[PDB]
Enzyme design. Structure first.
Site, PDB file in Angstrom:
ATOM      1  N   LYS A 132       0.823  -1.214   0.000  1.00 49.63           N
ATOM      2  CA  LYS A 132       0.000   0.000   0.000  1.00 49.63           C
ATOM      3  C   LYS A 132       0.850   1.254   0.000  1.00 49.63           C
ATOM      4  O   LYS A 132       0.324   2.359  -0.025  1.00 49.63           O
ATOM      5  CB  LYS A 132      -1.001  -0.014   1.171  1.00 49.63           C
ATOM      6  CG  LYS A 132      -2.106  -1.058   0.939  1.00 49.63           C
ATOM      7  CD  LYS A 132      -3.356  -0.810   1.767  1.00 49.63           C
ATOM      8  CE  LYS A 132      -4.334  -1.939   1.571  1.00 49.63           C
ATOM      9  NZ  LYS A 132      -5.635  -1.662   2.232  1.00 49.63           N
TER      10      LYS A 132
HETATM   11  C1  LIG Z   1      -5.297   5.136  -3.112  1.00 47.19           C
HETATM   12  C2  LIG Z   1      -5.850   5.607  -1.818  1.00 47.19           C
HETATM   13  C3  LIG Z   1      -6.537   4.857  -0.919  1.00 47.19           C
HETATM   14  C4  LIG Z   1      -6.953   3.418  -0.934  1.00 47.19           C
HETATM   15  O1  LIG Z   1      -6.621   2.888   0.355  1.00 47.19           O
HETATM   16  P1  LIG Z   1      -7.302   1.578   0.996  1.00 47.19           P
HETATM   17  O2  LIG Z   1      -7.633   0.517  -0.035  1.00 47.19           O
HETATM   18  O3  LIG Z   1      -6.526   1.071   2.193  1.00 47.19           O
HETATM   19  O4  LIG Z   1      -8.649   2.338   1.437  1.00 47.19           O
HETATM   20  P2  LIG Z   1     -10.172   2.142   0.900  1.00 47.19           P
HETATM   21  O5  LIG Z   1     -10.137   2.560  -0.589  1.00 47.19           O
HETATM   22  O6  LIG Z   1     -10.881   3.047   1.871  1.00 47.19           O
HETATM   23  O7  LIG Z   1     -10.460   0.682   1.113  1.00 47.19           O
HETATM   24  C5  LIG Z   1      -5.532   7.064  -1.533  1.00 47.19           C
HETATM   25  C6  LIG Z   1      -6.547   8.132  -1.955  1.00 47.19           C
HETATM   26  C7  LIG Z   1      -7.303   8.744  -0.755  1.00 47.19           C
HETATM   27  C8  LIG Z   1      -6.498   9.645   0.207  1.00 47.19           C
HETATM   28  C9  LIG Z   1      -7.418   9.914   1.410  1.00 47.19           C
HETATM   29  C10 LIG Z   1      -6.081  10.951  -0.508  1.00 47.19           C
HETATM   30  O8  LIG Z   1      -5.667  11.973   0.428  1.00 47.19           O
HETATM   31  C11 LIG Z   1      -6.070  13.264   0.221  1.00 47.19           C
HETATM   32  O9  LIG Z   1      -7.144  13.656  -0.219  1.00 47.19           O
HETATM   33  C12 LIG Z   1      -4.984  14.243   0.644  1.00 47.19           C
HETATM   34  N1  LIG Z   1      -4.084  13.782   1.485  1.00 47.19           N
HETATM   35  N2  LIG Z   1      -3.328  13.337   2.214  1.00 47.19           N
HETATM   36  C13 LIG Z   1      -4.855  15.670   0.207  1.00 47.19           C
HETATM   37  F1  LIG Z   1      -5.797  16.176  -0.604  1.00 47.19           F
HETATM   38  F2  LIG Z   1      -4.939  16.508   1.258  1.00 47.19           F
HETATM   39  F3  LIG Z   1      -3.658  15.894  -0.394  1.00 47.19           F
END
Ligand SMILES: C/C(=C\COP(=O)(O)OP(=O)(O)O)CCC[C@H](C)COC(=O)C(NN)C(F)(F)F
Ligand SMILES: [Mg+2]
Ligand SMILES: [Zn+2]
Lengths: 315, 403
Positions: A111
């Site tokens: 990840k």
């Molecule tokens: C690929 C990914 C998650 C998948 O992760 P995973 O699979 O573990 O989660 P899910 O999809 O919930 O199952 C990352 C995109 C989402 C972040 C929260 C982006 O962050 C922001 O928006 C900012 N900063 N830090 C800012 F804008 F401020 F820059």
């Protein structure tokens, strides 16, 4: 020689003979620190030595091996990743051995963003995508929804034109989990970049497959979103049979998804001068109320907005 | 009863797997059973439900973390301006003031993070990157003193942004780094706040962001990618800054985000068929005020005059009942450990869910005890609206760097 960071005989850099010549550089956190991390001795030791080699720009085999420890301690440190890439080129390091190393660390931290970006750089440098699809499939075998693995996969396929076996891979993962949204996304990615959805035989095959998936798992939102996504382009009202074919699932395969889709078809009909305008409007308004009050109350504000919007436009 | 999640009919919102089990349904059912145990705890212990935001516990966790952190935070050694922003913003939402000595120590530390070539790095002497650049500007704007504003080297910041700008309208996160929708948002946020937007800086950016909107209605990290709440917030917020929201299909986006609220949990998931998570309380629910503002600018007559287009009550209930760590701090879901990122976003999302605003109209929904009411947050910047006005007005006194 690689003295692993987790080895029982690992020794701090400050206790290593081959490092005696260099003074480690402490981090300047200022006189009154904020968000100050009380680093473990192992972390502070590697990072004070990383700072020394970076500050003096030492492009050595020892500095190269040290970046491996600094990355293992904190794989999100992009400054370390940058210096490691400077060293790979300056030292003329074998990039296939570096591919073996990146494979191992991605397996450990799948990840982390930096590890995937490093692998892309190596593939670009080597102009070799031959291990890619199989490596990614192994990561996807452990986490079928890993966002960076899917992103690296789409980059590899698009950059090296490796489209030919992707729809088959998609079909395999959909058999494993029909609810995998990353895979329905991959399906759309492949089709849109190969045949396209304008080809009537392709569209018919896709809608039929999706309706079969909806029959098997009626409450699976991904297949419903996919059906809408591939037909919303030209407009849902362009497909007159679809409405009656979904109405024919009203008693057996019903859900707030089918009802919401009916509202979507009605909205498009009303925007395209349909026959029986007031009849379609009242049907849509009835469903918006059923959704808001009974079947999809979490989305009451959305459904009430849609009701008001439809009234305002098609009264 | 008066809590939506505890009503007898709420049991009907449980997952329907159609007798077809897959990894997705199995993982969802596990989360639902865990959340149901939380919702029912009052019934099983024979107590009247009381929804209290643990302010003092959250305050202690935050005031301590602002100065010092354990080695568990070594994974965030390249994210120190993020720790400044997450903590300073959580304290701001909790109406906690910043002692002038603390404000000065934060300013000086961010100075050390600032690169001689513009932008901020994840720590002293680290190379610049758009994510700690965004966090450092936001933290300096929360402080909002002359000293904090003066930290930012505006001329080098503009130079830095130009160095990352791509011919296709996108931005690199850093030199020799990658492109994603976050970079467009980080660039637009810092550039608008500091008044460094030149006529060509964002040329093609709106068009590139619009290419990230997919068949689902939401926005992927790059074109072709699955719609995700974090990238969708970044994409829409950047377009609001640029006054280019119209480049997106706003209705397919509205349907996609509203669909991300979980009928059972009350919180939001990041993408379709994935799990609820407290941080999406901001990323996903924060899209509703942005969409409200965008649709209102188009003169939409059907918009609410009192509520956002999501269940404000059910989201507050998920955060208050499931996302608070008893020791202080907030989290993703029950069973997960607290962190400053989740503390920041759970509280950001709580504020959004409590405060509705549209022109003349102002309507609050405060679930539980009235002391739960947080300070409002700006839906574009995720810093206090007063801090947005103060910073924008200050930097507008300066000319845009002439290069
Ligand atoms: C690929 C990914 C998650 C998948 O992760 P995973 O699979 O573990 O989660 P899910 O999809 O919930 O199952 C990352 C995109 C989402 C972040 C929260 C982006 O962050 C922001 O928006 C900012 N900063 N830090 C800012 F804008 F401020 F820059
Ligand atoms: Mg990077
Ligand atoms: Zn989260």
């Amino acid at each position: 020689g690689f003295l692993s960071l987790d080895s029982p005989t690992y020794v701090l850099y400050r206790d290593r003979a081959e490092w005696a010549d260099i003074d480690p550089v402490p981090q300047n956190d200022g006189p009154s620190p904020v968000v100050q991390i009380i680093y473990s001795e192992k972390f502070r030791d590697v990072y004070d030595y990383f700072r020394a080699v970076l500050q003096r720009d030492e492009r050595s085999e020892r500095a190269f091996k040290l970046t491996r420890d600094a990355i293992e301690l904190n794989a999100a440190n992009y400054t370390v990743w940058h210096f490691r890439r400077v060293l790979l080129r300056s030292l003329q390091k074998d990039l296939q051995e570096e591919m073996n190393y990146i494979t191992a660390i991605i397996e450990e931290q799948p990840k982390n963003y930096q590890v995937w970006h490093h692998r892309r750089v190596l593939v670009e440098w080597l102009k070799d995508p031959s291990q890619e699809l199989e490596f990614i499939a192994d990561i996807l075998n452990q986490d079928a929804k890993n966002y960076h693995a899917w992103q690296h996969r789409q980059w590899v396929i698009q950059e090296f034109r490796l489209w030919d076996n992707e729809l088959q891979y998609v079909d395999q993962l959909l058999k494993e989990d029909v609810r995998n949204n990353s895979v329905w996304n991959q399906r759309h990615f492949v089709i849109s970049n190969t045949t396209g959805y304008s080809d009537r035989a392709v569209l018919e095959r896709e809608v039929q497959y999706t309706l079969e998936m909806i029959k098997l798992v009626p409450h699976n939102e991904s297949a419903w979103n996919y059906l809408k996504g591939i037909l919303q382009d030209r407009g849902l009202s362009r497909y007159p049979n679809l409405l009656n074919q979904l109405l024919d699932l009203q008693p057996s395969h019903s859900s707030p998804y089918l009802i919401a889709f009916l509202v979507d078809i009605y909205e498009d009909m009303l925007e395209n001068q349909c026959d029986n305008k007031e009849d379609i409007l009242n049907k849509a308004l009835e469903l918006c109320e059923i959704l808001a009050k009974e079947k999809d109350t979490i989305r009451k504000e959305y459904w009430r907005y849609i009701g008001r919007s439809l009234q305002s436009k098609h009264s | 009863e008066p809590l939506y999640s505890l009503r007898p009919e709420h049991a009907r919102e449980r997952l329907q797997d159609d007798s077809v089990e897959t990894v997705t349904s199995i993982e969802q059912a596990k989360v639902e059973e865990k959340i149901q145990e939380v919702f029912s705890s009052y019934k099983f212990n024979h107590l009247v439900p009381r929804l209290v935001l643990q302010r003092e516990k959250h305050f202690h966790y935050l005031k301590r973390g602002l100065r010092q952190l354990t080695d568990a935070y070594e994974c965030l050694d390249a994210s120190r301006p993020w720790l400044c922003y997450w903590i300073l913003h959580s304290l701001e939402l909790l109406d906690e003031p910043i002692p002038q000595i603390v404000a000065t120590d934060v300013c000086q530390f961010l100075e050390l993070c600032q690169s001689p070539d513009g932008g901020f790095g994840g720590g002293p002497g680290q190379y610049p990157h758009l994510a700690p650049t965004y966090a450092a500007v936001n933290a300096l704007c929360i402080i909002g003193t002359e000293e904090a504003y003066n930290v930012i080297n505006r001329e080098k910041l503009l130079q830095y942004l130009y160095s990352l700008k791509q011919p296709d309208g996108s931005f690199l996160m850093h030199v020799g780094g990658e492109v994603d929708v976050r970079s467009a948002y980080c660039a637009a946020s810092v550039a608008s706040l500091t008044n460094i937007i030149t006529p060509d800086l964002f040329e093609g950016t709106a068009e590139w962001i619009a290419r990230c909107q997919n068949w689902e209605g939401g926005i992927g990290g790059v074109p072709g990618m699955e719609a995700h709440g974090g990238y969708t917030f970044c994409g829409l917020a950047a377009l609001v800054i640029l006054k280019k929201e119209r480049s997106l299909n706003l209705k397919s986006l509205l349907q996609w985000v509203t669909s991300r609220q979980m009928r059972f949990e009350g919180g939001f998931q990041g993408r379709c068929n994935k799990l609820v998570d407290g941080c999406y309380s901001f990323w996903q629910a924060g899209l509703l005020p942005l969409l409200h503002r965008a649709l209102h600018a188009q003169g939409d007559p059907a918009l609410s005059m009192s509520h956002w287009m999501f269940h404000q009550q059910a989201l507050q209930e998920y955060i208050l009942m499931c996302c608070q760590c008893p020791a202080g701090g907030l989290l993703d879901k029950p069973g997960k450990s607290r962190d400053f990122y989740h503390t920041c976003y759970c509280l950001s999302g709580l504020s959004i869910a409590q405060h509705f605003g549209s022109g003349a109209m102002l309507h609050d929904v405060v679930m539980g005890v009235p002391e739960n009411v947080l300070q409002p947050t700006h839906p574009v910047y995720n810093i206090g609206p007063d801090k947005v006005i103060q910073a924008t007005t200050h930097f507008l006194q300066k000319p845009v760097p002439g290069f």
